[PDB]
Structures are given as structure tokens and as C-alpha cells.
Amino acid sequence: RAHRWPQPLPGNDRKIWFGADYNPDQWPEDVQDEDIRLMKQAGVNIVSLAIFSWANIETSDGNFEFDWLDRVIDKLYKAGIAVDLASATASPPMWLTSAHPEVLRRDEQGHVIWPGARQHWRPTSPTFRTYALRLCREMAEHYKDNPAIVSWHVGNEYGCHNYFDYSDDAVQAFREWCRDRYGTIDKVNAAWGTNFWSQRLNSFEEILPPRYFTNPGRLLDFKHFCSDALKEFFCAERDVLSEVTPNIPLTTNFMVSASQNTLDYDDWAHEVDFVSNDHYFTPGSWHIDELAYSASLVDGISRKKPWFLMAQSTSAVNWREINPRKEPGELIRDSMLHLAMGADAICYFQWRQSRSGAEKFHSAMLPLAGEHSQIYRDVCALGADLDTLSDAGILRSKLSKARVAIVQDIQSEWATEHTATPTQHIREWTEPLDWFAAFANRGVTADVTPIHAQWDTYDAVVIPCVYLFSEEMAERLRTFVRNGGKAFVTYYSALADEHDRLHTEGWPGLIGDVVGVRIEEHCPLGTLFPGMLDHLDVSNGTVVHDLADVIDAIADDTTVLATFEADPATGMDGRAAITVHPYHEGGVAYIAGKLGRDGISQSLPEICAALGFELDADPRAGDVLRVVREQEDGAIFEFLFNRTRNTVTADRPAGDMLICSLATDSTDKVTLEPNGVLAFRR
Amino acid sequence: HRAHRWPQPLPGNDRKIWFGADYNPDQWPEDVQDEDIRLMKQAGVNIVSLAIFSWANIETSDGNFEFDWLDRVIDKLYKAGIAVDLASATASPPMWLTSAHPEVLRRDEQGHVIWPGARQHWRPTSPTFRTYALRLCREMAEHYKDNPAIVSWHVGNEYGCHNYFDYSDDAVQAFREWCRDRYGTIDKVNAAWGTNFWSQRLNSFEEILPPRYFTNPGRLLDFKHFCSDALKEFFCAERDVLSEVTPNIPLTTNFMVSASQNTLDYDDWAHEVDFVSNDHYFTPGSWHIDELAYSASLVDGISRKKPWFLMAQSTSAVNWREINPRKEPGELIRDSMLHLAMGADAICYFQWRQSRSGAEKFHSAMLPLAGEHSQIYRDVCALGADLDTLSDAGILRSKLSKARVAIVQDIQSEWATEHTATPTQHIREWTEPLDWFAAFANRGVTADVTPIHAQWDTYDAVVIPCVYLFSEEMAERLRTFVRNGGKAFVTYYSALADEHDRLHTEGWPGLIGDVVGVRIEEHCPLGTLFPGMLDHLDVSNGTVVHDLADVIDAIADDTTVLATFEADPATGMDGRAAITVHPYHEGGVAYIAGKLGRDGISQSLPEICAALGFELDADPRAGDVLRVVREQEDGAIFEFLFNRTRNTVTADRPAGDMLICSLATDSTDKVTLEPNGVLAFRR
């Protein structure tokens, strides 16, 4: 579906968008002039409105009021601040839930989710759909041809909570979903099979949603269904809006992060004009790498098209058990990281910190400390930096193509989440992250690519715990390697087909010819009981934890790079841990256990040399993350990030210094403090 | 603010320190009572509490009340010279009541009916239950009217130990009315609670629902407050029936005051009793002594230095923890003495006789299953003898002396700190005063723990420990206190929000920044939730901050920095102020920018106190023993000494007559206390 970016207010040039969601219907109106003045001072050129404002718009059934919203849009418009308008359907009013409790979601035991909870509505509720679609229409009619409205923010963060509904509506929708996908009940039974204690289904009317063992095939599809049910609802809403206002681009805010495991966002991405994401930092060592990863993923989801950062935090969030604040410079750096990874818009949640409500301790662009605060000063500096990058022509440039793509796959994640796997300590989502960080440690910025993206055009691909391999997936991987591709393939790859039906005759399934390895069972690892086998040393100085493959046999042309070292009694001593295997013009290395970020990093030079993937032999390669956006004219925008907890010194990129935070430009070398960032144009 | 009335002796008897426990005769055969009574007399037991859970044995069926079994045992107790603290007997309703009226049963957050057999399975706001309860109160009062054995009323039992949170239809309606009464108009409600970013304001009181398992923190604050008020009302209702029929019997209800108690506003409830009574159970380990001393001090603060009643404690182990450690030799006597020293004029246990069955069977008692020939019973006897000795020495009605420093405790600040969307779940209000109590004790200063509405503003110094909620009136008291020469210790997590949990603006601490001399824009929470997370901050005086530090952006020109943080420069905390001191006219303000814990505070106390001009004993042995002092009007002084450490210590002998000693020794020049030892002197 066609890429469509939000366009400037009439009279304005195209700028990197910079703003936050704004909630003036929750403040007295006399506040707005100060907010706007501070917005303009910060370099803020957009705000997102009406997201949770339904009860202030449809104040009673059928009755729509727009006075307050028109007044604030008017003020914002005169200051030159655009409005990313919401469908306002995210959070229904109390009169709606009180008159119509059948729109309220049910949990696994039939407990009604009380209003006041966020997203307490059934995505498959026909009644709620009618109310919501009416509101979309009223909103779209009213703001039709208003030059202040530059995009639609449809709903808000779908499935942040209402992902799992067990109401009657959901039960029927899941049946119909199964009907559309499988046609006949025989094909369903073929897909799901049977739990040993139960028997085949006789009709679609016998299908019930899985609850808290469950049928893994049914659970896989049920998760799939939940994403589709919410996708359909978003599409219905989007379709109402583009009918009335066909020239205003539409989006909804995704929640892409390394561990996100609800929506298939790559699938959802086909239904948006532009991809927008909300990302909040992971505290600690993973702060930089996980943000970089998620941002790389969003761009992969965007097929290297410009995307929109709809939300992040200026400092601490409010929803963890412990909410650390951001360190100095991280506010700007994090924003630059999203930017470098292809964003052409940087927004926050929220503009102004609140004195009450559950979000009161959540940071904002304008903290309770007010205009005289380090955050606000940093927000202003950020606005200036984005303005500077705008003028240097960064807009619409694309995140350059990596030498290696790391495959991410939401469905394999779903499959790995079942409670009867070899171990609960292995999930799909951590392996791609680990590979991203390890390559970064060797000075290689990878592209994180969803499984349906074109990773098979890259020089190399990482296949990290891709549990689910369809035959077509097997062919792409086979074709890729035969034609010269280099592949890194790990444990927990190709265990089953698209229906979670385990492959037979040995693991990895389907692609054993390419990989050159056969596995009959796994060796899970841990400390659950005294004396349990908790780790396996690998012969190259690394250690595997949580799970290792038991490699039974390798092909005659398979080379062993490293073996496991263990007590002989385990049957794992001398067994292959890392292998490399030629397949025509490629190209396949196999990693038989979870090595973690460092273990992979430690193994990378030896694996890469055997595959013929050139690595920088510089031991300082990992010190800084280089992220590069490219224009058609050949202009290159290189961002540099300190990955470490110490000041580093690096060779100066060629070109003009555009931006610097906690960093220093010199003639021969460049200097970045911890959390520092530099941007150059060459 | 109600008039103090202490339970008075049986006719013909002198005033003695009360000593007893709740007694269980409707759960034993009657032929046991003579032996129990004989053993009580031998133990020095002069009082028991009866009928607490005995409703089903009194109103044996709807409308029918029998008192025979109870009249008989009271008679036996009376002839033995043992007084009775009678209960309203309304704590645990009979099954015939819950069966005919399940509408009295509580609902959980999800609407599940709490089944009978759980204790306090009843709705505090049930009108049907209140009528049944008040009928029983009246019957109890009619029947024991003018009975001379009955010296007090034990109204109900430990309100809100379990039934604090009810989500039934009654609670929903009661909470609206509670809100209507407190705010008048829905405009005032919405102004108080604000909005969650995802929802919008209320249009009417009828739209108000109780918060459940994120919530609106302002609403949750008030809901907790409501839950306390709803139970307070029910107690007042019962109390009013009993004092109407028998106006000459003083009434109480048993509180559960301990360092971490977080349900009822007991300071508020204290305004509704004739005398304050408390139930306290020891905290095992290093905190055993200090937490008991703290809790007892608090009761005395709550009681405005008037005598209070220890209604319950354990002789040895309890039964409701995951591991129930037993008491060490001497701890039984010491703990009773610790309560006593902190102002109790009564010492009672749960329970008199250990039971063979029921969930309490492993809970220790005054008379264990092991029987009369047991270490606990021998100890009980020695204690009873010692209380008689202290009675004759004239300790009754003496007051816990006025400390040089008060430590402010605040249930509402605790409530507010309990919300799941704060900077961290590892900071609660309740631990901070406790820490300060222990630290001063480690420097030889017994502090008075004072609830926020007590007169901490008359003391030489005050500790403001995580007092999250600061009203404008609260800010003025502190300002006036310090201006007029008071010395204050103020910590992180103080003055964050107003009384409605609305965060103060322009910087923290709110309102009192002029006094404190420090400005904070945000917090720096600490922990190990993720790898490489910042988990601690070294302080330049050798201490370490955990869980949370303030980010102090700027200080006043007359603010002096005593210690700074030491950290990775990348954190933005390196060299930043950790402990400051600030003159404000004639005071008086030290700021502590993170959680130092007992040892960290204790280490910091000399340098802070020297700067504030608070004189400390330079004796490094100051912490070895806790000195607690009760005072009479005539000038009589009762000084108790408690060993705080795990080794035998030696101290300068107090002046006066040695009255009591357990695991301790009197000598001419020096005094000796073994671990867990206690001495008492009259001077």
C-alpha cells in the first residue's frame, strides 16, 4: 500500500516532525498560550490530539461537540503547529459502557473487565464497531478541509491490553476466522492435531478458544486471530476516514520493541500509509542496542521507507517495578538513534507532565519542574538539532542496506511461547537481539528484517531461533545459499511447519541438506534441581546456557569449528557446537546453543572467516555504532553513537559535522563521551 | 480528642498493671476452668478477655441469646479475683447468620463472595449486618450491665485485618457517599483525582466506582481512606450502643500498630476510644527490638503520651508467617518490658492456653500444650511477678518522657507511596521513620515516634521521613517550627504531592523549598531489574544509597553540602549533593537525598547533627543499650535498660533502686546486660 507522509502546513517547508501528544481537554483552557509559546521555543511543529478524548466529543449518545477542540486547533494553527488528529476511538465514554456492557471484554474465566481499565472493549464487538465508526465519520466530516489537520492517528496502540478477549463475540469470530482459513473442519484437525488426552473436532461449532495445557497449534492460530481481529477493526476505521478525507494520510501507533509479542506488525504494516512506532527504553546495558534494534526493525517493517516515531520518553516511564531516569544526553541520543534508523518524525508522550492520574510520574517534554528544567532545556536543544538536520536535507533519505540481515518473526515467537516446549527459558525474540548486538560489537550495523521482508537479497542472513519453517521458507533459504548467500543458523530453527507441526526424520527440518547437520533431540540446561546440567562450555572459550542441540551427525563436507566440553556422562562431550557447511556457492554456519551477546561476539571472527564474511580486525570496532542514511543524490548521513560506558575516540568521518551531543569534532579524530552522538554529511 | 478512661480494678482491689490474655472457655470443656484459673493466679494473671469470637455461642439462633456458659466462667474468674475485659462478641457472625443473609458476605475485586470460615468475611457497610451486630451489642450490654467483674469493653476484633477491602454493592454506594460528603460536588472530585491520561472526567457521583487490581492514584488514596473511615463508623456505632447501656465501662478496640501496618489510620481511630489498645507481634531477626520499640513508641504517640493497653502479643512463635521462629531466652520478658517502658499500663497475650486444633494450634500461648512444666509458663510466671513488683513501685500512670527528637509517621503518605506507577516499588513511606528510629538509637537517642497530627512541632528536632504528602498547613507548621529554632531532618520522597496526591510543581520538595534549600526536578531510582542497571550510589562519607536518590539540580546560596554522590560520571550523579544542611532563621534543616538505611543514617548522624547543632553523646558505646524513661508528676523516674546487641554489654549504673532484672545484673558502679537483657530502675 502507497507510502504517504504527513505534509506541512500551507506556507511551510517540509521539516522533520517534532512534537508530542497533547491533552488540552484535561487542563484549564487558560494554559494553552504558555504551552504553545514553550512549544514554539522548543522547536515543536506538531502535536497529536484527541487520542483519548471520546467522552469530551461524543459527550452523550449521538451528541457531538467540537468547540474546545476547534479553539485549541485554531491557536495551534496560528502558531504554525500542525495537528496529527486521532480518530478518538481508543477510549469509550462511561455512558457507552454503562448502556452497553456487552462491549466490555471478558478474561479467561468470564470476568468482565471494568471500565477505567485501558482498552476494555471487545475488538470483535459489532455494537462497539458501530459506535466507533460513527465517531470516525463525525470527526472526519468536521475536520474535512481543515488545513491544520495533517494526519490521522487511528485509535491508539491496539492490543496493548485488549489483545485477548474471551467473550461470546470473540468465540464466534475465532470460529469464522478458522472457517475462512481452513474451509473445512478436517483441515483444522489436520493443522492442530490432537492433545493426547482429547480427540478430533467434529464441527466448527465445537471450536473454543484456548485458556490457561492447551493445544499449541490452536494457541498459535488464536494469537494469529487476535492480531487479525484488531487489524480488521483498524481497517474499518481507516476506511471510514479516507472516504471523507482522502488526502490526509493515516497511521496507527505500533509498539515495536525486542520483546513485543502481541501484534504481527509486519502484517499490519500493509494497512498503513506510513509506519509509526512507540518505543520506550530498556534500562541498563541494553539501552542503546535494544533501541537501535527495535528502530532497525521498524525500518525493516517499513521496507526502508521513512517512518514516524510517535512516542518515547524524555526521561523515566511509569509502568515498571523500578523506573530509572535517563542519564544526561540520552534524551537527544535516543532521538538521534530513531532518526538515524530512518525516522523522519520524532514525537514524545506526552507534552506536559500531569499532576494527577496514573501517568503523573511519567516524564514529559515539559516536566512539573516547568520551563526551568534540564529536560526542557534538552528538549529545546533537540528541536534545534532536528531543524538543523532538516535544512541539511536528511528528509526521505533511506537507512542504508546492511551487509547482513537478522530475521525476526512474530509467529515463531508465538510458537516458542507454549508451556510444553523443551524449556520455558528459550523464546524466539532474544536470539535476533543477541545477534544484532554481537555484530555491532564487531563494528557491523545489521538490518533487522521481518521474515517476509527481502533478507534473501543481503550478502548474509541470520536465522535466529526461527522455529517455524514452511516449505516455501525452506526454499528461499536454500535458494539464497545455493546462489552464494552466507547464512548463520541457530538452534530452535525449523522445528515445525507453519501450523506448529514438528518436522520428522530429524532437525533442522526441511533444510538439513543446506545446513549439513542432523539433530534428534535437545539438551535443555538449567538449575531447576540440584545437580542439573546448567551450562555447556564450548571449545573456543564461550559458554552455552539454557538449551543446546544434540547434534547426532554432520555431513561429510561439514566442518566443526567448536565442540562442547562437558562431563563425558552427559553424552555431550566432544559433540558439535558450531559447524560450517558449504552448499554450492554458500554459505551455512550452524550454532547449536544460546551463546548470548558476548558468546556470539566471541565466536564471530572464526565463523565469519570460514564463511568468507570479512570483518574489521580492529578491536575497537565495537566501541561505536555507525548508522547511515542515504539520499538519491549520493549524500550520506553518518551517525556515530558511543556504545560504551567510557569516552571513545574514533577516526573522523569525512564531511560536514551537522549535530553533536556529548561529543567533539577535531581534524583527525572524533571524540564521543558516553551516550554521545555525532552526525556528518558526506 | 475523647476523654481518657482506664479500666479500673475489681471492687476491693488496688490498682495493678493488668496482666492476662484472651481466654477461650467456650472452646474447651468446662472442667478445665478450675485448672486454668489456678494457673492464672500462679502466673499473676489479673485479667482475661472473653467472648471475642463467641457470637455463635451467644446468639445461638436468630433472636435467641444465651449467657449461661459465660455467666459461670465470669463467676469463677470473679471469685478468683480475675477481672474481665468483655468483648462485644460481634467479630465473627454465626453460620445461621451468613446462611440466611449471604448479603453480609464481602466481595473481592472480581465480585467473588468471601466464604464463611474466613475471618471477617463481612461487609463493613452492610446495613443488614449492622442491625444484627448492634442487637448483639445491646444484648451483651443489657445482660452484663452492673456486673462488677466486667471492667472494660473489647469492641469487635482487629477491624480490617482482612475485611479492609470490600467491593460489594454496599461498598460501591458507601464510597460515593463518602465522596459526596468529602467533596460536595463532582467538580471538586474531578479536581482532586484529576484524570488518567486515557480516560476523562466524571459527570456525576453515580459514575464513581472503587479502584481495582493501573488505577487513578488520587482515587486509590481516597478509597483507602474510605475503607478506614467505613470501619471506624462501624466501630463507633457499636461503641455507642455499649456506652449507652453501660456508660461506666471504658471501651476500646484492639489496634494492629507495627512498622509496616498499612490499612487503618490508627491515629485517626484513636480519637474514638477511651484508651488505646494495641496488638503487636515481634519481627524476627535483627529488627526484633528496634521494630518493637518503634511500634510501641508509635502507640504512645498515637495515645498522646497517655497510658495504653497491650492487648496482644506472642509468648513465642506466631503461626501466620512462612517461617515462624520461636523467641530466644529472655525475649518474652524483655518484649513485655519494652511495651511497658513505652507507656503501656497493661500487658496481655494471645492466647491463654494453646489449642490442639484449628489454624492457631501452632501459635504460642501463655500455657503451652507442653503444660505447666514448660519454659514459657515459668517465664510467664516470672513476668507476672515482675509486673506486680512494678505495680507496687508506683509506675502506673507515669508518662513516656518527652524525647529530644520526634520522627513523623504518616499512614496517608504510606498509602500514596503504595501506588504501582511511582518511580519505584521499592520505596514505601513506612520503612524510613523506622530506619531513623533505629539510627538515633544507635547514637543513644530514644526518639518519640509521632503521627503527623501529633505535636512534633514542639520538639527540639523532627525527622520528616518520606512524608510524601505535604498540605499547605503542613508546610507552614514545618516552616514555623524551623524558623523558631527547630531542627529538621528531611529526606527524599517528602513533600511530593498535596493531600490529594497531586504532585507539587516548579520543583521538589514542594512548598518547603525555601526552608529546605534544595531543588529537585526528578528522581534517580536504583536497582537490578535489568543487566547493567544503576543499582546503588556511593556517598562521599562512606555510606551507600539504595533504591532511590533525588537528583538535586540546585541549592540555595546559604545551603552547605555535607556529602556528595560518587558514581560513574555518565550517570549524571557524580559530585551531586547527597546530604545538605540549611539555616532558616533560627533553624535548622538537613536534607537527605536518598535511602541510606539504618546503618547509613547512623553513620551520617554525627556529621549532620554537629552541623545542625544537635548535641550527641560522643561515647561510641551509646548504641549498646536503649534507655526508655517513664515520668511521674511527683518527680518519680522509671528508667528501663535494654541490650540492643548480640553480646553482653556493660553500662554506668543508673541512680536509684533496681526493680526488675532479666538476663541482667546490678553491681555498684557498673550494670551488666546479657543479650536480650532488661533492667528497670526507680529514681
Ligand SMILES: [Zn+2]
Ligand atoms: Zn471468578
